[PDB]
């Protein structure tokens, strides 16, 4: 389960990334919604 927490520190990081894309995509100016020049 300690490994779990490490895995979810990566999933967490990826969700943190996804929330980061949420932080970008909340700005609809980021029209592509894909791997773009800001990711």
PDB file of N, CA and C in Angstrom:
ATOM      1  N   UNK A   1       0.846  -1.222   0.000  1.00  0.00           N
ATOM      2  CA  UNK A   1       0.000   0.000   0.000  1.00  0.00           C
ATOM      3  C   UNK A   1       0.870   1.257   0.000  1.00  0.00           C
ATOM      4  N   UNK A   2       2.086   1.149   0.518  1.00  0.00           N
ATOM      5  CA  UNK A   2       3.035   2.250   0.446  1.00  0.00           C
ATOM      6  C   UNK A   2       3.429   2.488  -1.005  1.00  0.00           C
ATOM      7  N   UNK A   3       3.565   1.394  -1.745  1.00  0.00           N
ATOM      8  CA  UNK A   3       3.784   1.456  -3.182  1.00  0.00           C
ATOM      9  C   UNK A   3       2.579   2.080  -3.874  1.00  0.00           C
ATOM     10  N   UNK A   4       1.379   1.704  -3.431  1.00  0.00           N
ATOM     11  CA  UNK A   4       0.150   2.314  -3.917  1.00  0.00           C
ATOM     12  C   UNK A   4       0.245   3.829  -3.868  1.00  0.00           C
ATOM     13  N   UNK A   5       0.654   4.328  -2.716  1.00  0.00           N
ATOM     14  CA  UNK A   5       0.794   5.757  -2.490  1.00  0.00           C
ATOM     15  C   UNK A   5       1.837   6.367  -3.419  1.00  0.00           C
ATOM     16  N   UNK A   6       2.798   5.558  -3.837  1.00  0.00           N
ATOM     17  CA  UNK A   6       3.802   6.002  -4.795  1.00  0.00           C
ATOM     18  C   UNK A   6       3.202   6.035  -6.186  1.00  0.00           C
ATOM     19  N   UNK A   7       2.371   5.052  -6.460  1.00  0.00           N
ATOM     20  CA  UNK A   7       1.682   4.960  -7.727  1.00  0.00           C
ATOM     21  C   UNK A   7       0.691   6.105  -7.861  1.00  0.00           C
ATOM     22  N   UNK A   8       0.032   6.430  -6.762  1.00  0.00           N
ATOM     23  CA  UNK A   8      -0.937   7.510  -6.761  1.00  0.00           C
ATOM     24  C   UNK A   8      -0.273   8.850  -6.520  1.00  0.00           C
ATOM     25  N   UNK A   9       1.034   8.827  -6.376  1.00  0.00           N
ATOM     26  CA  UNK A   9       1.820  10.040  -6.426  1.00  0.00           C
ATOM     27  C   UNK A   9       2.180  10.324  -7.871  1.00  0.00           C
ATOM     28  N   UNK A  10       1.970   9.311  -8.695  1.00  0.00           N
ATOM     29  CA  UNK A  10       2.180   9.410 -10.127  1.00  0.00           C
ATOM     30  C   UNK A  10       0.857   9.641 -10.819  1.00  0.00           C
ATOM     31  N   UNK A  11      -0.144   8.860 -10.436  1.00  0.00           N
ATOM     32  CA  UNK A  11      -1.506   9.125 -10.849  1.00  0.00           C
ATOM     33  C   UNK A  11      -1.931  10.465 -10.313  1.00  0.00           C
ATOM     34  N   UNK A  12      -1.544  10.721  -9.078  1.00  0.00           N
ATOM     35  CA  UNK A  12      -1.805  11.997  -8.467  1.00  0.00           C
ATOM     36  C   UNK A  12      -1.148  13.112  -9.238  1.00  0.00           C
ATOM     37  N   UNK A  13       0.061  12.840  -9.707  1.00  0.00           N
ATOM     38  CA  UNK A  13       0.817  13.786 -10.513  1.00  0.00           C
ATOM     39  C   UNK A  13       0.167  13.955 -11.886  1.00  0.00           C
ATOM     40  N   UNK A  14      -0.413  12.874 -12.386  1.00  0.00           N
ATOM     41  CA  UNK A  14      -1.065  12.872 -13.689  1.00  0.00           C
ATOM     42  C   UNK A  14      -2.427  13.535 -13.617  1.00  0.00           C
ATOM     43  N   UNK A  15      -3.106  13.329 -12.509  1.00  0.00           N
ATOM     44  CA  UNK A  15      -4.356  14.015 -12.229  1.00  0.00           C
ATOM     45  C   UNK A  15      -4.068  15.480 -11.978  1.00  0.00           C
ATOM     46  N   UNK A  16      -2.932  15.718 -11.352  1.00  0.00           N
ATOM     47  CA  UNK A  16      -2.413  17.052 -11.140  1.00  0.00           C
ATOM     48  C   UNK A  16      -2.063  17.695 -12.469  1.00  0.00           C
ATOM     49  N   UNK A  17      -1.719  16.848 -13.416  1.00  0.00           N
ATOM     50  CA  UNK A  17      -1.447  17.263 -14.767  1.00  0.00           C
ATOM     51  C   UNK A  17      -2.755  17.539 -15.465  1.00  0.00           C
ATOM     52  N   UNK A  18      -3.705  16.672 -15.209  1.00  0.00           N
ATOM     53  CA  UNK A  18      -5.015  16.771 -15.816  1.00  0.00           C
ATOM     54  C   UNK A  18      -5.766  17.966 -15.266  1.00  0.00           C
ATOM     55  N   UNK A  19      -5.469  18.311 -14.025  1.00  0.00           N
ATOM     56  CA  UNK A  19      -6.056  19.480 -13.409  1.00  0.00           C
ATOM     57  C   UNK A  19      -5.314  20.716 -13.884  1.00  0.00           C
ATOM     58  N   UNK A  20      -4.091  20.490 -14.312  1.00  0.00           N
ATOM     59  CA  UNK A  20      -3.279  21.502 -14.935  1.00  0.00           C
ATOM     60  C   UNK A  20      -3.803  21.797 -16.324  1.00  0.00           C
ATOM     61  N   UNK A  21      -4.162  20.747 -17.046  1.00  0.00           N
ATOM     62  CA  UNK A  21      -4.817  20.919 -18.320  1.00  0.00           C
ATOM     63  C   UNK A  21      -6.180  21.499 -18.091  1.00  0.00           C
ATOM     64  N   UNK A  22      -6.727  21.235 -16.928  1.00  0.00           N
ATOM     65  CA  UNK A  22      -7.967  21.854 -16.534  1.00  0.00           C
ATOM     66  C   UNK A  22      -7.715  23.328 -16.287  1.00  0.00           C
ATOM     67  N   UNK A  23      -6.525  23.619 -15.770  1.00  0.00           N
ATOM     68  CA  UNK A  23      -6.112  24.988 -15.516  1.00  0.00           C
ATOM     69  C   UNK A  23      -5.830  25.731 -16.821  1.00  0.00           C
ATOM     70  N   UNK A  24      -5.553  24.980 -17.875  1.00  0.00           N
ATOM     71  CA  UNK A  24      -5.350  25.565 -19.190  1.00  0.00           C
ATOM     72  C   UNK A  24      -6.659  25.636 -19.935  1.00  0.00           C
ATOM     73  N   UNK A  25      -7.335  24.517 -19.938  1.00  0.00           N
ATOM     74  CA  UNK A  25      -8.544  24.324 -20.706  1.00  0.00           C
ATOM     75  C   UNK A  25      -9.719  25.113 -20.150  1.00  0.00           C
ATOM     76  N   UNK A  26      -9.633  25.519 -18.885  1.00  0.00           N
ATOM     77  CA  UNK A  26     -10.577  26.486 -18.341  1.00  0.00           C
ATOM     78  C   UNK A  26     -10.494  27.780 -19.144  1.00  0.00           C
ATOM     79  N   UNK A  27      -9.354  27.956 -19.796  1.00  0.00           N
ATOM     80  CA  UNK A  27      -9.157  29.027 -20.742  1.00  0.00           C
ATOM     81  C   UNK A  27      -9.401  28.477 -22.137  1.00  0.00           C
ATOM     82  N   UNK A  28     -10.640  28.598 -22.587  1.00  0.00           N
ATOM     83  CA  UNK A  28     -11.101  28.044 -23.860  1.00  0.00           C
ATOM     84  C   UNK A  28     -10.247  28.489 -25.055  1.00  0.00           C
ATOM     85  N   UNK A  29      -9.402  29.488 -24.843  1.00  0.00           N
ATOM     86  CA  UNK A  29      -8.424  29.876 -25.847  1.00  0.00           C
ATOM     87  C   UNK A  29      -7.529  28.712 -26.240  1.00  0.00           C
ATOM     88  N   UNK A  30      -7.432  27.733 -25.350  1.00  0.00           N
ATOM     89  CA  UNK A  30      -6.717  26.499 -25.620  1.00  0.00           C
ATOM     90  C   UNK A  30      -7.595  25.561 -26.442  1.00  0.00           C
ATOM     91  N   UNK A  31      -7.994  26.039 -27.608  1.00  0.00           N
ATOM     92  CA  UNK A  31      -8.961  25.348 -28.465  1.00  0.00           C
ATOM     93  C   UNK A  31      -8.575  23.906 -28.850  1.00  0.00           C
ATOM     94  N   UNK A  32      -7.294  23.615 -29.197  1.00  0.00           N
ATOM     95  CA  UNK A  32      -6.886  22.278 -29.663  1.00  0.00           C
ATOM     96  C   UNK A  32      -7.380  21.128 -28.780  1.00  0.00           C
ATOM     97  N   UNK A  33      -7.193  21.246 -27.462  1.00  0.00           N
ATOM     98  CA  UNK A  33      -7.513  20.158 -26.537  1.00  0.00           C
ATOM     99  C   UNK A  33      -6.789  18.892 -26.959  1.00  0.00           C
ATOM    100  N   UNK A  34      -5.483  18.943 -26.824  1.00  0.00           N
ATOM    101  CA  UNK A  34      -4.604  17.888 -27.293  1.00  0.00           C
ATOM    102  C   UNK A  34      -3.196  18.192 -26.827  1.00  0.00           C
ATOM    103  N   UNK A  35      -2.242  17.365 -27.216  1.00  0.00           N
ATOM    104  CA  UNK A  35      -0.848  17.715 -27.044  1.00  0.00           C
ATOM    105  C   UNK A  35      -0.526  18.899 -27.940  1.00  0.00           C
ATOM    106  N   UNK A  36      -0.374  20.052 -27.322  1.00  0.00           N
ATOM    107  CA  UNK A  36      -0.133  21.286 -28.039  1.00  0.00           C
ATOM    108  C   UNK A  36       1.078  21.992 -27.445  1.00  0.00           C
ATOM    109  N   UNK A  37       1.333  23.215 -27.892  1.00  0.00           N
ATOM    110  CA  UNK A  37       2.513  23.950 -27.462  1.00  0.00           C
ATOM    111  C   UNK A  37       2.373  24.541 -26.071  1.00  0.00           C
ATOM    112  N   UNK A  38       1.769  23.771 -25.182  1.00  0.00           N
ATOM    113  CA  UNK A  38       1.603  24.140 -23.787  1.00  0.00           C
ATOM    114  C   UNK A  38       0.933  22.987 -23.042  1.00  0.00           C
ATOM    115  N   UNK A  39       1.747  22.091 -22.514  1.00  0.00           N
ATOM    116  CA  UNK A  39       1.236  20.856 -21.938  1.00  0.00           C
ATOM    117  C   UNK A  39       2.226  20.323 -20.910  1.00  0.00           C
TER     118      UNK A  39
END
